[PDB]
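Schema walkthrough. Field components (list of strings):
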Amino acid sequence: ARQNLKSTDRAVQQMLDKAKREGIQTVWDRYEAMKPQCGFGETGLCCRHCLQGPCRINPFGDEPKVGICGATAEVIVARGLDRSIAAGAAGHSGDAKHLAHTLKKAVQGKAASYMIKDRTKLHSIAKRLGIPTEGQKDEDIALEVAKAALADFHEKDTPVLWVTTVLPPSRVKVLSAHGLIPAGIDHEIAEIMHRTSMGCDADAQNLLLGGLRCSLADLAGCYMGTDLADILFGTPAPVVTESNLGVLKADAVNVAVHGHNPVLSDIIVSVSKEMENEARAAGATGINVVGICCTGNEVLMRHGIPACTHSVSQEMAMITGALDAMILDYQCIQPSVATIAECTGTTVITTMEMSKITGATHVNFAEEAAVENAKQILRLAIDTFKRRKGKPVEIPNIKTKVVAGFSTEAIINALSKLNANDPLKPLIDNVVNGNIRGVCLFAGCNNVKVPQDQNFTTIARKLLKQNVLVVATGCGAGALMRHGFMDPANVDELCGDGLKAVLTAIGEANGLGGPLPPVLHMGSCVDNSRAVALVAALANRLGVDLDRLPVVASAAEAMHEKAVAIGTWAVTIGLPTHIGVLPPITGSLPVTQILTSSVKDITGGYFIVELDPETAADKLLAAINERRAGLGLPW
Amino acid sequence: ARQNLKSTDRAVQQMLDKAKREGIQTVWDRYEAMKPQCGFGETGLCCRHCLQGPCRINPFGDEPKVGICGATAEVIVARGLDRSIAAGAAGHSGDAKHLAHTLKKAVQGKAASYMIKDRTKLHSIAKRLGIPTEGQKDEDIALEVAKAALADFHEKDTPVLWVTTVLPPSRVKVLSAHGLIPAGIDHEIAEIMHRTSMGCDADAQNLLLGGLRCSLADLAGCYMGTDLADILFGTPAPVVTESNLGVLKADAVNVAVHGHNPVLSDIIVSVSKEMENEARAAGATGINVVGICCTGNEVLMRHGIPACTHSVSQEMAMITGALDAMILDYQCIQPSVATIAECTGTTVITTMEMSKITGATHVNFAEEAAVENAKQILRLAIDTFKRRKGKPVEIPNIKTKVVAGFSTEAIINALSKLNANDPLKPLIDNVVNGNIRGVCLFAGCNNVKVPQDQNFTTIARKLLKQNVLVVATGCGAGALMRHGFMDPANVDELCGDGLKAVLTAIGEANGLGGPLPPVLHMGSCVDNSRAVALVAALANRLGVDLDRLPVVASAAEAMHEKAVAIGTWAVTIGLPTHIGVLPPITGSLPVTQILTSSVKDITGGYFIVELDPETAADKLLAAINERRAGLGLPW
Ligand code: SF4
Ligand code: SF4
Ligand code: FES
Ligand code: FES
Ligand SMILES: [Fe+3]
Ligand SMILES: [Fe+3]
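Field assembly_structure (string):
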């Protein structure tokens, strides 16, 4: 079998060979077994919103042409897309809500394992929300910030402040004029579910305006999530670590943290250090915490925990035979891991009441009992490592060097070595003179339909040669880190002369043997909000709105409903937004035209749907260069 | 064509003939054009929760057997059902939330067309919520009640009070022990959308427990909706009116109110009386307000507005040629009405920002401008009536007499004529001696898959002969009213001797020429909460929980996601609950077994899935009689 058609990651290819000869079914095998997939669903032309269904519409030809209730293709497509945005919003904001309750508990004395770690961040958030700090205790400031976070989930006298206080006033003004500012995060999710139910909203433009507003609720959830985690766990600064399956170690207890919420994994990290000697006694060198998906990104950014794999290839960590435990909370966890665990000997542990997997061991995690629960979990991992004594494992000897931890604050600090009191100016200077063509954010997942990482790396390589400053989050950062894009030793090979000069100048001014890495890792998926903060700060420094800046986003291999919500709010805040996988919209030309074209007249952003990555790179460059020409810059 | 295979309503049959020869496509024609429908969707074995999809699972045979991410049939079925419950919850609770904001505006001086109409109801609700009334102004009590309603949508220090204060403490105790009490209405909707997104909750029992809890959020939305509308518009008392298309009048301006929220339609009713002479000048006898769906039920219950049609047959009102306007807010409105309007000359008017229909005229309704907006809308209706001057119309000369308005308070009052200080005892007496075998609630929609009204009337006839006291809401009440079941002249023909004696005894004691009607109309779909109040009051009077009472529910022809939510909370509060249409669950035997059987061990309720109405009637009788035998009663 040609494993490079499944993944461009050589360590993943090696594990696919091992899974094949051991007879362990993979996500790629389940994909093959699903082909050919349903064309009504692929195009968006299916509706199950009531029990008169299921209804479908032929993309071309004869009947059925319309849903049983009269719903058109346009309504059906818009309604399905709207529910996906609401679902993504519900995940990101459920993540943030957990962080909000955790911060509240922490400063109320209910969970001593948690504390205010970043006082500076606490105060800057309180100030941005209009929460007075002068004369207040940190605990009381934090209490107020947690209360404001929870208040943004419902209607109140103010709109969602994690939208209106994080975007430039001019952007908020154009969104308010279209009625797009969310009134409450869960309020908007519920309204989507209402308006998309049978016999309700049946106008594509009305429905899609609702989706834009719900995407801003998703953005608020992301930004709140990043804010609260930085308070609780620290704002990331530049770190050095490694990535890919070669970060596992046969002689250690290998513990993957997988899912999204750092309330769990940050505790695993610190507790695993406390139990090192208990692990030495079981015959291990120690506990080797490694990261998968966003929760791994979280502990990579803050602690330098090596990333072992991401997204579509998550099963391959287990296939090595050396993964003793996989500790889960929620989101983007293939449920197959619970059945594969029986073949690989991995102990799979769920921790969240609303995210169980049949066959997995459930260990309830309560923030009030975080250390005790973590030790109960890590002891299951040690028992498992003992059980594989004298078993051979196959860990591919494949890893990359990863410089990461580029929070927006860290980026501002790095630039400040070139201009202390105007740190954004050196970046803008080099945009203006052409050393930086523009900025591209890579975000989102892998998708089994796309050879793993192929779009991310193909697009990134073209952009970097054209002097684009590339930043990345989530499993887009995962793809780029696993292929060397976060190793500064690759600046010469990857970057155009102008971008190299800039990365080198900044790196030299920060006391480094050389340049920043080719791609700046800005964090998890909620940390797409960091890219927003940076671009908003650039917008404010220049006196223009985001839809005039040479900034684009690419969800190059998108999968999750969360990635659709992110892409939609990237469009809503004004960015040309590439998506490298077909969302289910092509069954409706009017919807596609709204999302790819007429939405420009509303928010200035627009979707770029392009499945061929070389073509996508050209379209993203043209989008960047059209912005440059709109600022009167050469390009 | 055999029109009685489409509808058992003779007036609907006549209009189907007219639509056929005029070439106007109907919901039944769009259904025919959809056959055969997708079996993966019918069985629940389809998932589009991420962009790796669509995924499907063969009910039998070979691959695909599992979703691409590893999701089993059980997870896929549970996840889809959970989203339908959340969507229904979002509709009923969005309805209530609108009523809450309307009551707040009214007692804040912002909307003088609205007022506290039922002071007694206001105070009894405030008392039930623990809101002190002693020494308070009505406006301040109402302000507090509106604030408590809005607070139930989010997390707070108390759970959802429109659950915990409306069910017996013993029922709340068994639900709390299973973790089923909702924490906030929109909180639960969002959590469903989160836990059902890709890579999250993947255990059928865990997922379905979540659905039970979200259904209680739906129940809270229903009960809040009924409570607030009764405050604002009056608690219903016995009324006499008529139903079916024969209530339209060629010589009047015929105005249908259609949708769900009475904040709009109650104003249409009163304003339409003010503009009677303006309508006389356009050559009409007056304005003939008639009802469709739940908003018609609302004005039927409170004002005696005749019901013209319901649910699946809503288009047929327009086909008469005499419907000058159809005034819409949201929910259960077939979007086809906007295109049919062009053939029939009806003016279709949308009023709610989140519920537009392409091609319909949008007139924004603001509660602050209710009278002015209503007159702008009614003037469009008058213009339309003038345009059909000299046109023939075909109004089937078919209607029934309808006694309705049986709120739980009205039922208690009627019984109190037999026992002033213990009004529930005469009912319990006649349950015990066998004159009343038990109680059956008919609820929910019509569904195009079922010949309209056939399940409702077949089941009702068998139950009434067996002395079951039948109550009904929504389009179940609509089906029964259109077939004479709310006409007391039909008691002799329809009711067993024991039930007749009881209906006659109660009717005689309320100064009537004879008995109560064969079926008690308890209101709209949110007014299913009234049936809950009655059964809860019976439970409390007897000292037992609802799952020991001889009470059942039948969603005999269910359609909307709302009907699934209602059925699920009927099971959750302890009722044997028939559904007469296949929900998409049969692709998973474990899910079906949970919902039809093992949930008995959790809540005491259970689903009875039975598509044959004679068999369903037998199963509902057995369920009733098993309850009777559990109380030690003969049966
Ligand atoms: S909402 Fe309309 S289009 Fe969707 S399943 Fe029901 S009848 Fe069909
Ligand atoms: S969530 Fe799993 S089952 Fe559903 S579409 Fe995505 S891969 Fe397929
Ligand atoms: S018909 Fe295949 S997705 Fe519904
Ligand atoms: S395959 Fe038909 S409902 Fe999805
Ligand atoms: Fe993620
Ligand atoms: Fe209804």
